[PDB]
Design a protein around this ligand. Sequence first.
Ligand code: HEM
Ligand SMILES: [O-]
Length: 154
Amino acid sequence: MVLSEGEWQLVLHVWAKVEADVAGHGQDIYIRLFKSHPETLEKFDRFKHLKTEAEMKASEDLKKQGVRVLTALGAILKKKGHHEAELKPLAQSHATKHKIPIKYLEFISEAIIHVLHSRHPGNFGADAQGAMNKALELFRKDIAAKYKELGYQG
Ligand code: HEM
Ligand SMILES: [O-]
């Protein structure tokens, strides 16, 4: 699939607000993912012991992880679909090292949309949410194809 430039601009205008405080947005996204789909926390060997939202919020390592994840995703979005180089290493680590099914990529995509809808009504109206869903679907579609090339079902 292919996004229009207008759609990419709606994605990048909300991402500019995320970048005001990437750490805080990453904590909210993880808290939402782990609360909504608790099975996903089991994939993180360093964090799977966390029991409550308060513990998740206080984890300096989880906060650092969130920054890494949103910064990598932000670099993919800024390529506006020309993200083959960025997707290579990520697909390899997520298929082979971490073993993250496509379904769990759908769960984190849902969590990102939920947090942007909550924090950024000014830049996350219906058209902008639609454009971000398209961008994240494109990301998952391209990751899934790479998973298959790498020998992972997903
Ligand atoms: C937007 C989708 C995602 C992005 C951009 C992303 C990005 C990253 C990056 C950049 C790293 C560090 C380098 C690497 O190992 O590749 C990482 C590590 C990791 N990712 Fe993801 N990730 C995503 C989704 C997920 C999901 C949904 C899960 C699990 C349910 C997951 C599980 C992990 C784990 C377990 C690690 C190792 C963390 C640690 O060092 O403790 N990832 N991810
Ligand atoms: O992650």
